[PDB]
mmCIF file of all heavy atoms in Angstrom:
data_model
loop_
_atom_site.group_PDB
_atom_site.id
_atom_site.type_symbol
_atom_site.label_atom_id
_atom_site.label_comp_id
_atom_site.label_asym_id
_atom_site.label_seq_id
_atom_site.Cartn_x
_atom_site.Cartn_y
_atom_site.Cartn_z
ATOM 1 N N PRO B 48 50.175 144.102 226.306
ATOM 2 C CA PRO B 48 49.601 143.971 224.971
ATOM 3 C C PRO B 48 48.465 142.952 224.916
ATOM 4 O O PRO B 48 48.339 142.107 225.800
ATOM 5 C CB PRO B 48 50.786 143.527 224.110
ATOM 6 C CG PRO B 48 51.733 142.919 225.057
ATOM 7 C CD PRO B 48 51.573 143.667 226.341
ATOM 8 N N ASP B 49 47.624 143.072 223.900
ATOM 9 C CA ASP B 49 46.613 142.056 223.599
ATOM 10 C C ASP B 49 47.181 140.906 222.769
ATOM 11 O O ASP B 49 46.861 139.748 223.045
ATOM 12 C CB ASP B 49 45.397 142.692 222.936
ATOM 13 C CG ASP B 49 44.651 143.648 223.886
ATOM 14 O OD1 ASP B 49 44.820 143.597 225.139
ATOM 15 O OD2 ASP B 49 43.880 144.480 223.374
ATOM 16 N N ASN B 50 48.035 141.216 221.785
ATOM 17 C CA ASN B 50 48.677 140.192 220.984
ATOM 18 C C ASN B 50 50.021 139.844 221.593
ATOM 19 O O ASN B 50 51.006 140.590 221.482
ATOM 20 C CB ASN B 50 48.843 140.641 219.541
ATOM 21 C CG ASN B 50 49.287 139.503 218.626
ATOM 22 O OD1 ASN B 50 50.369 138.935 218.793
ATOM 23 N ND2 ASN B 50 48.437 139.153 217.670
ATOM 24 N N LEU B 51 50.070 138.689 222.231
ATOM 25 C CA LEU B 51 51.300 138.248 222.873
ATOM 26 C C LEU B 51 52.395 137.827 221.865
ATOM 27 O O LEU B 51 53.579 138.108 222.099
ATOM 28 C CB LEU B 51 50.942 137.132 223.857
ATOM 29 C CG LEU B 51 51.948 136.475 224.764
ATOM 30 C CD1 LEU B 51 52.959 137.425 225.380
ATOM 31 C CD2 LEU B 51 51.153 135.745 225.835
ATOM 32 N N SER B 52 52.008 137.215 220.731
ATOM 33 C CA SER B 52 52.983 136.702 219.737
ATOM 34 C C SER B 52 53.801 137.792 219.079
ATOM 35 O O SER B 52 54.933 137.544 218.676
ATOM 36 C CB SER B 52 52.304 135.897 218.632
ATOM 37 O OG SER B 52 51.333 135.005 219.147
ATOM 38 N N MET B 53 53.223 138.991 218.953
ATOM 39 C CA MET B 53 53.954 140.150 218.440
ATOM 40 C C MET B 53 54.551 141.010 219.552
ATOM 41 O O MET B 53 54.985 142.110 219.294
ATOM 42 C CB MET B 53 53.094 140.974 217.432
ATOM 43 C CG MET B 53 52.075 141.980 217.985
ATOM 44 S SD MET B 53 50.938 142.616 216.707
ATOM 45 C CE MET B 53 49.869 143.729 217.623
ATOM 46 N N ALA B 54 54.591 140.507 220.780
ATOM 47 C CA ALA B 54 55.370 141.132 221.853
ATOM 48 C C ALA B 54 56.755 140.491 222.000
ATOM 49 O O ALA B 54 57.622 141.057 222.660
ATOM 50 C CB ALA B 54 54.627 141.040 223.179
ATOM 51 N N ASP B 55 56.939 139.294 221.438
ATOM 52 C CA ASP B 55 58.254 138.637 221.389
ATOM 53 C C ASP B 55 58.221 137.625 220.248
ATOM 54 O O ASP B 55 57.346 136.773 220.209
ATOM 55 C CB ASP B 55 58.568 137.965 222.731
ATOM 56 C CG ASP B 55 59.968 137.370 222.795
ATOM 57 O OD1 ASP B 55 60.435 136.796 221.786
ATOM 58 O OD2 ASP B 55 60.596 137.430 223.875
ATOM 59 N N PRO B 56 59.168 137.716 219.306
ATOM 60 C CA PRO B 56 59.085 136.764 218.191
ATOM 61 C C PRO B 56 59.269 135.288 218.624
ATOM 62 O O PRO B 56 58.708 134.408 218.003
ATOM 63 C CB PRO B 56 60.187 137.242 217.234
ATOM 64 C CG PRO B 56 61.146 138.024 218.085
ATOM 65 C CD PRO B 56 60.343 138.604 219.210
ATOM 66 N N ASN B 57 59.983 135.048 219.720
ATOM 67 C CA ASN B 57 60.114 133.706 220.304
ATOM 68 C C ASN B 57 58.906 133.145 221.098
ATOM 69 O O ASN B 57 59.002 132.055 221.663
ATOM 70 C CB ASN B 57 61.356 133.658 221.192
ATOM 71 C CG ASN B 57 62.635 133.861 220.404
ATOM 72 O OD1 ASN B 57 62.773 133.362 219.289
ATOM 73 N ND2 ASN B 57 63.564 134.610 220.974
ATOM 74 N N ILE B 58 57.785 133.861 221.152
ATOM 75 C CA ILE B 58 56.554 133.364 221.765
ATOM 76 C C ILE B 58 55.530 133.245 220.658
ATOM 77 O O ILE B 58 55.292 134.201 219.947
ATOM 78 C CB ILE B 58 56.049 134.334 222.854
ATOM 79 C CG1 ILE B 58 57.125 134.506 223.934
ATOM 80 C CG2 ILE B 58 54.742 133.833 223.471
ATOM 81 C CD1 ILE B 58 56.685 135.252 225.180
ATOM 82 N N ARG B 59 54.909 132.088 220.517
ATOM 83 C CA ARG B 59 54.103 131.803 219.343
ATOM 84 C C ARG B 59 52.834 131.032 219.725
ATOM 85 O O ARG B 59 52.915 130.010 220.393
ATOM 86 C CB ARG B 59 54.960 131.015 218.330
ATOM 87 C CG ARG B 59 54.235 130.495 217.084
ATOM 88 C CD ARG B 59 55.219 129.988 216.023
ATOM 89 N NE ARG B 59 55.621 128.591 216.243
ATOM 90 C CZ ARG B 59 56.798 128.040 215.908
ATOM 91 N NH1 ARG B 59 57.774 128.737 215.335
ATOM 92 N NH2 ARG B 59 57.005 126.756 216.173
ATOM 93 N N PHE B 60 51.672 131.554 219.315
ATOM 94 C CA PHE B 60 50.392 130.944 219.582
ATOM 95 C C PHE B 60 50.347 129.591 218.917
ATOM 96 O O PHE B 60 50.762 129.446 217.792
ATOM 97 C CB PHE B 60 49.227 131.806 219.068
ATOM 98 C CG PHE B 60 47.874 131.142 219.221
ATOM 99 C CD1 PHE B 60 47.234 131.093 220.474
ATOM 100 C CD2 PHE B 60 47.266 130.507 218.143
ATOM 101 C CE1 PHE B 60 46.032 130.419 220.635
ATOM 102 C CE2 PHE B 60 46.061 129.834 218.310
ATOM 103 C CZ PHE B 60 45.444 129.793 219.554
ATOM 104 N N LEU B 61 49.838 128.606 219.628
ATOM 105 C CA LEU B 61 49.719 127.252 219.112
ATOM 106 C C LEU B 61 48.268 126.858 218.989
ATOM 107 O O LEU B 61 47.827 126.416 217.932
ATOM 108 C CB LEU B 61 50.434 126.293 220.060
ATOM 109 C CG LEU B 61 50.670 124.837 219.670
ATOM 110 C CD1 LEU B 61 51.649 124.737 218.522
ATOM 111 C CD2 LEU B 61 51.244 124.096 220.862
ATOM 112 N N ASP B 62 47.525 126.996 220.079
ATOM 113 C CA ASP B 62 46.167 126.511 220.131
ATOM 114 C C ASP B 62 45.443 126.979 221.408
ATOM 115 O O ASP B 62 46.065 127.456 222.356
ATOM 116 C CB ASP B 62 46.173 124.968 220.076
ATOM 117 C CG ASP B 62 44.974 124.389 219.330
ATOM 118 O OD1 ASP B 62 43.978 125.098 219.083
ATOM 119 O OD2 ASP B 62 45.024 123.197 219.000
ATOM 120 N N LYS B 63 44.122 126.837 221.396
ATOM 121 C CA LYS B 63 43.292 127.081 222.544
ATOM 122 C C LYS B 63 43.089 125.783 223.263
ATOM 123 O O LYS B 63 42.993 124.740 222.626
ATOM 124 C CB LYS B 63 41.941 127.603 222.121
ATOM 125 C CG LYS B 63 42.024 128.911 221.386
ATOM 126 C CD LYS B 63 40.658 129.331 220.869
ATOM 127 C CE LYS B 63 40.788 130.434 219.833
ATOM 128 N NZ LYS B 63 39.503 130.575 219.104
ATOM 129 N N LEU B 64 43.022 125.852 224.593
ATOM 130 C CA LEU B 64 42.523 124.734 225.411
ATOM 131 C C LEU B 64 41.042 124.592 225.077
ATOM 132 O O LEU B 64 40.463 125.526 224.529
ATOM 133 C CB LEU B 64 42.685 125.035 226.899
ATOM 134 C CG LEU B 64 43.657 124.332 227.860
ATOM 135 C CD1 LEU B 64 44.757 123.481 227.219
ATOM 136 C CD2 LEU B 64 44.222 125.347 228.862
ATOM 137 N N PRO B 65 40.421 123.430 225.370
ATOM 138 C CA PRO B 65 38.941 123.369 225.293
ATOM 139 C C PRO B 65 38.291 124.368 226.244
ATOM 140 O O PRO B 65 38.810 124.603 227.336
ATOM 141 C CB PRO B 65 38.607 121.942 225.746
ATOM 142 C CG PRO B 65 39.882 121.380 226.304
ATOM 143 C CD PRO B 65 41.003 122.102 225.617
ATOM 144 N N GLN B 66 37.170 124.947 225.832
ATOM 145 C CA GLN B 66 36.500 125.970 226.625
ATOM 146 C C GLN B 66 35.934 125.430 227.925
ATOM 147 O O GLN B 66 35.601 124.249 228.032
ATOM 148 C CB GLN B 66 35.354 126.563 225.851
ATOM 149 C CG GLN B 66 35.766 127.343 224.625
ATOM 150 C CD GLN B 66 34.565 127.873 223.883
ATOM 151 O OE1 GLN B 66 33.436 127.440 224.135
ATOM 152 N NE2 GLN B 66 34.792 128.838 222.983
ATOM 153 N N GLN B 67 35.851 126.303 228.921
ATOM 154 C CA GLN B 67 35.095 126.024 230.139
ATOM 155 C C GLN B 67 33.938 127.030 230.172
ATOM 156 O O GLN B 67 34.169 128.235 230.137
ATOM 157 C CB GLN B 67 35.981 126.138 231.385
ATOM 158 C CG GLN B 67 35.174 126.120 232.672
ATOM 159 C CD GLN B 67 36.018 126.232 233.918
ATOM 160 O OE1 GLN B 67 37.233 126.048 233.890
ATOM 161 N NE2 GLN B 67 35.370 126.536 235.023
ATOM 162 N N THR B 68 32.702 126.534 230.214
ATOM 163 C CA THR B 68 31.527 127.410 230.282
ATOM 164 C C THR B 68 30.669 127.185 231.521
ATOM 165 O O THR B 68 30.686 126.119 232.125
ATOM 166 C CB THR B 68 30.626 127.276 229.040
ATOM 167 O OG1 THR B 68 29.963 126.003 229.079
ATOM 168 C CG2 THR B 68 31.442 127.427 227.761
ATOM 169 N N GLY B 69 29.911 128.225 231.865
ATOM 170 C CA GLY B 69 28.980 128.212 232.984
ATOM 171 C C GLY B 69 28.106 129.460 233.019
ATOM 172 O O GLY B 69 28.489 130.534 232.535
ATOM 173 N N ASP B 70 26.924 129.311 233.602
ATOM 174 C CA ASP B 70 26.051 130.433 233.884
ATOM 175 C C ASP B 70 26.685 131.283 234.981
ATOM 176 O O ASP B 70 27.131 130.764 235.986
ATOM 177 C CB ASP B 70 24.658 129.949 234.313
ATOM 178 C CG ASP B 70 23.929 129.151 233.206
ATOM 179 O OD1 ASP B 70 24.353 129.190 232.015
ATOM 180 O OD2 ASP B 70 22.914 128.494 233.546
ATOM 181 N N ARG B 71 26.736 132.591 234.778
ATOM 182 C CA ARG B 71 27.450 133.499 235.687
ATOM 183 C C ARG B 71 26.680 134.804 235.711
ATOM 184 O O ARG B 71 26.573 135.461 234.681
ATOM 185 C CB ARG B 71 28.886 133.755 235.190
ATOM 186 C CG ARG B 71 29.805 132.540 235.071
ATOM 187 C CD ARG B 71 30.542 132.204 236.370
ATOM 188 N NE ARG B 71 31.377 133.341 236.793
ATOM 189 C CZ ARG B 71 31.131 134.182 237.792
ATOM 190 N NH1 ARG B 71 30.098 133.995 238.598
ATOM 191 N NH2 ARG B 71 31.964 135.211 238.008
ATOM 192 N N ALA B 72 26.137 135.169 236.872
ATOM 193 C CA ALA B 72 25.463 136.464 237.078
ATOM 194 C C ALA B 72 24.392 136.829 236.026
ATOM 195 O O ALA B 72 24.286 138.000 235.623
ATOM 196 C CB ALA B 72 26.519 137.564 237.173
ATOM 197 N N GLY B 73 23.614 135.830 235.587
ATOM 198 C CA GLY B 73 22.559 136.017 234.570
ATOM 199 C C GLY B 73 22.925 135.811 233.107
ATOM 200 O O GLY B 73 22.040 135.864 232.218
ATOM 201 N N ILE B 74 24.218 135.602 232.843
ATOM 202 C CA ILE B 74 24.703 135.298 231.501
ATOM 203 C C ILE B 74 24.765 133.794 231.353
ATOM 204 O O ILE B 74 25.435 133.093 232.141
ATOM 205 C CB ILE B 74 26.073 135.934 231.232
ATOM 206 C CG1 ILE B 74 25.924 137.460 231.319
ATOM 207 C CG2 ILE B 74 26.650 135.525 229.853
ATOM 208 C CD1 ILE B 74 27.229 138.203 231.422
ATOM 209 N N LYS B 75 24.056 133.315 230.341
ATOM 210 C CA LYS B 75 24.018 131.912 230.017
ATOM 211 C C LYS B 75 25.291 131.560 229.268
ATOM 212 O O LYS B 75 25.601 132.216 228.281
ATOM 213 C CB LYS B 75 22.794 131.602 229.152
ATOM 214 C CG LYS B 75 22.697 130.146 228.711
ATOM 215 C CD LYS B 75 21.266 129.631 228.750
ATOM 216 C CE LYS B 75 21.151 128.242 228.126
ATOM 217 N NZ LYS B 75 21.455 127.179 229.122
ATOM 218 N N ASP B 76 26.017 130.549 229.763
ATOM 219 C CA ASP B 76 27.254 130.025 229.123
ATOM 220 C C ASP B 76 28.354 131.066 228.909
ATOM 221 O O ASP B 76 28.813 131.266 227.784
ATOM 222 C CB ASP B 76 26.923 129.348 227.797
ATOM 223 C CG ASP B 76 25.863 128.277 227.947
ATOM 224 O OD1 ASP B 76 25.998 127.385 228.804
ATOM 225 O OD2 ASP B 76 24.871 128.342 227.220
ATOM 226 N N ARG B 77 28.721 131.763 229.986
ATOM 227 C CA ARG B 77 29.914 132.567 229.983
ATOM 228 C C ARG B 77 31.128 131.674 229.714
ATOM 229 O O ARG B 77 31.264 130.592 230.283
ATOM 230 C CB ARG B 77 30.090 133.294 231.305
ATOM 231 C CG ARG B 77 31.234 134.286 231.279
ATOM 232 C CD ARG B 77 31.127 135.345 232.366
ATOM 233 N NE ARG B 77 32.403 136.048 232.528
ATOM 234 C CZ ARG B 77 32.677 136.925 233.484
ATOM 235 N NH1 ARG B 77 31.764 137.259 234.389
ATOM 236 N NH2 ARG B 77 33.884 137.466 233.551
ATOM 237 N N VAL B 78 32.012 132.155 228.850
ATOM 238 C CA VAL B 78 33.080 131.351 228.327
ATOM 239 C C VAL B 78 34.417 131.816 228.903
ATOM 240 O O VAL B 78 34.790 132.996 228.792
ATOM 241 C CB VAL B 78 33.094 131.455 226.783
ATOM 242 C CG1 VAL B 78 34.083 130.463 226.161
ATOM 243 C CG2 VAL B 78 31.694 131.222 226.221
ATOM 244 N N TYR B 79 35.125 130.861 229.501
ATOM 245 C CA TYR B 79 36.530 130.978 229.902
ATOM 246 C C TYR B 79 37.381 130.170 228.897
ATOM 247 O O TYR B 79 37.388 128.939 228.983
ATOM 248 C CB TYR B 79 36.658 130.409 231.337
ATOM 249 C CG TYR B 79 35.763 131.185 232.294
ATOM 250 C CD1 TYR B 79 34.438 130.790 232.513
ATOM 251 C CD2 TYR B 79 36.190 132.387 232.878
ATOM 252 C CE1 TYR B 79 33.583 131.532 233.316
ATOM 253 C CE2 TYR B 79 35.336 133.142 233.670
ATOM 254 C CZ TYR B 79 34.028 132.703 233.902
ATOM 255 O OH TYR B 79 33.155 133.430 234.705
ATOM 256 N N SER B 80 38.037 130.825 227.920
ATOM 257 C CA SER B 80 39.108 130.166 227.120
ATOM 258 C C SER B 80 40.524 130.628 227.445
ATOM 259 O O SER B 80 40.746 131.759 227.863
ATOM 260 C CB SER B 80 38.909 130.261 225.602
ATOM 261 O OG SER B 80 38.586 131.563 225.238
ATOM 262 N N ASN B 81 41.473 129.717 227.214
ATOM 263 C CA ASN B 81 42.870 129.928 227.474
ATOM 264 C C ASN B 81 43.699 129.470 226.286
ATOM 265 O O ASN B 81 43.374 128.473 225.640
ATOM 266 C CB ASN B 81 43.262 129.165 228.714
ATOM 267 C CG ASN B 81 42.579 129.699 229.954
ATOM 268 O OD1 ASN B 81 41.540 129.197 230.339
ATOM 269 N ND2 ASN B 81 43.141 130.736 230.569
ATOM 270 N N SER B 82 44.762 130.218 226.003
ATOM 271 C CA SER B 82 45.638 129.958 224.883
ATOM 272 C C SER B 82 46.953 129.261 225.297
ATOM 273 O O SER B 82 47.526 129.521 226.376
ATOM 274 C CB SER B 82 45.921 131.282 224.187
ATOM 275 O OG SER B 82 44.735 131.808 223.600
ATOM 276 N N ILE B 83 47.392 128.336 224.439
ATOM 277 C CA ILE B 83 48.664 127.615 224.576
ATOM 278 C C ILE B 83 49.706 128.245 223.629
ATOM 279 O O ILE B 83 49.418 128.506 222.454
ATOM 280 C CB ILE B 83 48.507 126.144 224.175
ATOM 281 C CG1 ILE B 83 47.400 125.461 224.971
ATOM 282 C CG2 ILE B 83 49.805 125.364 224.362
ATOM 283 C CD1 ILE B 83 46.783 124.307 224.198
ATOM 284 N N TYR B 84 50.907 128.471 224.149
ATOM 285 C CA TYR B 84 51.994 129.067 223.378
ATOM 286 C C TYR B 84 53.208 128.152 223.409
ATOM 287 O O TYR B 84 53.363 127.373 224.335
ATOM 288 C CB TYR B 84 52.399 130.424 223.949
ATOM 289 C CG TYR B 84 51.357 131.469 223.754
ATOM 290 C CD1 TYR B 84 50.288 131.590 224.646
ATOM 291 C CD2 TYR B 84 51.447 132.359 222.708
ATOM 292 C CE1 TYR B 84 49.308 132.545 224.459
ATOM 293 C CE2 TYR B 84 50.472 133.323 222.504
ATOM 294 C CZ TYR B 84 49.404 133.418 223.380
ATOM 295 O OH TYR B 84 48.462 134.402 223.172
ATOM 296 N N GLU B 85 54.024 128.243 222.363
ATOM 297 C CA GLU B 85 55.329 127.616 222.305
ATOM 298 C C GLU B 85 56.339 128.709 222.565
ATOM 299 O O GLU B 85 56.142 129.862 222.183
ATOM 300 C CB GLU B 85 55.605 127.058 220.920
ATOM 301 C CG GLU B 85 54.656 125.986 220.435
ATOM 302 C CD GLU B 85 55.268 125.144 219.320
ATOM 303 O OE1 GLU B 85 55.649 125.732 218.274
ATOM 304 O OE2 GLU B 85 55.403 123.906 219.513
ATOM 305 N N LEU B 86 57.429 128.345 223.197
ATOM 306 C CA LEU B 86 58.477 129.283 223.493
ATOM 307 C C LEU B 86 59.686 128.836 222.735
ATOM 308 O O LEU B 86 60.058 127.683 222.858
ATOM 309 C CB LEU B 86 58.706 129.285 224.992
ATOM 310 C CG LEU B 86 57.412 129.742 225.689
ATOM 311 C CD1 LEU B 86 57.285 129.146 227.063
ATOM 312 C CD2 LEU B 86 57.337 131.255 225.750
ATOM 313 N N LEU B 87 60.253 129.713 221.907
ATOM 314 C CA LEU B 87 61.465 129.400 221.127
ATOM 315 C C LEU B 87 62.750 129.966 221.735
ATOM 316 O O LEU B 87 62.751 131.010 222.373
ATOM 317 C CB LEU B 87 61.368 129.919 219.699
ATOM 318 C CG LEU B 87 60.145 129.533 218.861
ATOM 319 C CD1 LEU B 87 60.311 130.131 217.472
ATOM 320 C CD2 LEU B 87 59.927 128.043 218.764
ATOM 321 N N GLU B 88 63.851 129.270 221.487
ATOM 322 C CA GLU B 88 65.176 129.713 221.881
ATOM 323 C C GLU B 88 66.131 129.238 220.793
ATOM 324 O O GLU B 88 66.237 128.036 220.537
ATOM 325 C CB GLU B 88 65.510 129.080 223.210
ATOM 326 C CG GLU B 88 66.828 129.495 223.836
ATOM 327 C CD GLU B 88 67.167 128.630 225.036
ATOM 328 O OE1 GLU B 88 66.668 127.481 225.133
ATOM 329 O OE2 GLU B 88 67.947 129.081 225.896
ATOM 330 N N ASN B 89 66.769 130.190 220.113
ATOM 331 C CA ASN B 89 67.627 129.930 218.946
ATOM 332 C C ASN B 89 66.985 129.021 217.920
ATOM 333 O O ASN B 89 67.599 128.069 217.453
ATOM 334 C CB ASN B 89 68.977 129.389 219.403
ATOM 335 C CG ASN B 89 69.722 130.393 220.253
ATOM 336 O OD1 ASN B 89 70.088 131.459 219.752
ATOM 337 N ND2 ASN B 89 69.927 130.085 221.546
ATOM 338 N N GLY B 90 65.733 129.311 217.593
ATOM 339 C CA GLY B 90 64.994 128.574 216.567
ATOM 340 C C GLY B 90 64.554 127.156 216.943
ATOM 341 O O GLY B 90 64.139 126.386 216.062
ATOM 342 N N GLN B 91 64.639 126.808 218.230
ATOM 343 C CA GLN B 91 64.201 125.503 218.758
ATOM 344 C C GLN B 91 62.973 125.682 219.637
ATOM 345 O O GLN B 91 62.922 126.594 220.443
ATOM 346 C CB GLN B 91 65.309 124.868 219.624
ATOM 347 C CG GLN B 91 66.553 124.439 218.878
ATOM 348 C CD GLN B 91 66.250 123.397 217.830
ATOM 349 O OE1 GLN B 91 65.678 122.366 218.157
ATOM 350 N NE2 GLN B 91 66.618 123.656 216.567
ATOM 351 N N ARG B 92 61.999 124.805 219.466
ATOM 352 C CA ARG B 92 60.894 124.663 220.395
ATOM 353 C C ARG B 92 61.484 124.173 221.705
ATOM 354 O O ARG B 92 61.992 123.048 221.777
ATOM 355 C CB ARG B 92 59.841 123.674 219.873
ATOM 356 C CG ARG B 92 59.075 124.199 218.671
ATOM 357 C CD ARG B 92 58.257 123.162 217.897
ATOM 358 N NE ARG B 92 57.431 122.400 218.829
ATOM 359 C CZ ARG B 92 57.665 121.156 219.238
ATOM 360 N NH1 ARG B 92 58.704 120.441 218.782
ATOM 361 N NH2 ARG B 92 56.827 120.610 220.115
ATOM 362 N N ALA B 93 61.415 125.035 222.716
ATOM 363 C CA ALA B 93 61.981 124.799 224.024
ATOM 364 C C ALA B 93 60.954 124.634 225.145
ATOM 365 O O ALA B 93 61.281 124.162 226.204
ATOM 366 C CB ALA B 93 62.934 125.935 224.370
ATOM 367 N N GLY B 94 59.724 125.056 224.943
ATOM 368 C CA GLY B 94 58.710 124.862 225.955
ATOM 369 C C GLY B 94 57.345 125.162 225.387
ATOM 370 O O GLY B 94 57.196 125.871 224.401
ATOM 371 N N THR B 95 56.353 124.591 226.029
ATOM 372 C CA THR B 95 54.996 124.806 225.686
ATOM 373 C C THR B 95 54.182 124.962 226.957
ATOM 374 O O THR B 95 54.296 124.163 227.857
ATOM 375 C CB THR B 95 54.498 123.633 224.870
ATOM 376 O OG1 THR B 95 55.249 123.616 223.676
ATOM 377 C CG2 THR B 95 53.023 123.790 224.505
ATOM 378 N N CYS B 96 53.338 125.984 227.005
ATOM 379 C CA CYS B 96 52.526 126.218 228.182
ATOM 380 C C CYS B 96 51.330 127.126 227.928
ATOM 381 O O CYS B 96 51.257 127.874 226.951
ATOM 382 C CB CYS B 96 53.377 126.809 229.293
ATOM 383 S SG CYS B 96 53.936 128.467 228.930
ATOM 384 N N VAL B 97 50.385 127.042 228.845
ATOM 385 C CA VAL B 97 49.251 127.947 228.814
ATOM 386 C C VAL B 97 49.690 129.231 229.534
ATOM 387 O O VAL B 97 50.195 129.197 230.646
ATOM 388 C CB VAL B 97 47.855 127.291 229.118
ATOM 389 C CG1 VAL B 97 47.946 125.927 229.728
ATOM 390 C CG2 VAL B 97 46.917 128.204 229.881
ATOM 391 N N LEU B 98 49.572 130.334 228.810
ATOM 392 C CA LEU B 98 50.215 131.581 229.129
ATOM 393 C C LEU B 98 49.305 132.772 228.882
ATOM 394 O O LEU B 98 48.619 132.861 227.865
ATOM 395 C CB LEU B 98 51.440 131.713 228.237
ATOM 396 C CG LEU B 98 52.458 132.806 228.445
ATOM 397 C CD1 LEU B 98 53.121 132.683 229.805
ATOM 398 C CD2 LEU B 98 53.488 132.677 227.316
#
Side-chain angles (χ1 to χ4, degrees):
Chain B
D49 294 342
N50 190 297
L51 183 40
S52 316
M53 82 191 179
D55 185 321
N57 296 321
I58 301 189
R59 174 168 85 210
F60 175 77
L61 190 67
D62 214 345
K63 298 175 195 165
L64 249 14
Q66 294 178 346
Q67 169 180 345
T68 71
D70 297 345
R71 299 273 300 106
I74 298 165
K75 178 141 172 86
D76 306 308
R77 187 160 165 188
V78 188
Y79 301 89
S80 47
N81 294 94
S82 294
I83 305 153
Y84 291 84
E85 299 201 302
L86 298 151
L87 307 182
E88 184 190 23
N89 297 295
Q91 292 299 305
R92 291 166 50 256
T95 296
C96 68
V97 15
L98 189 62

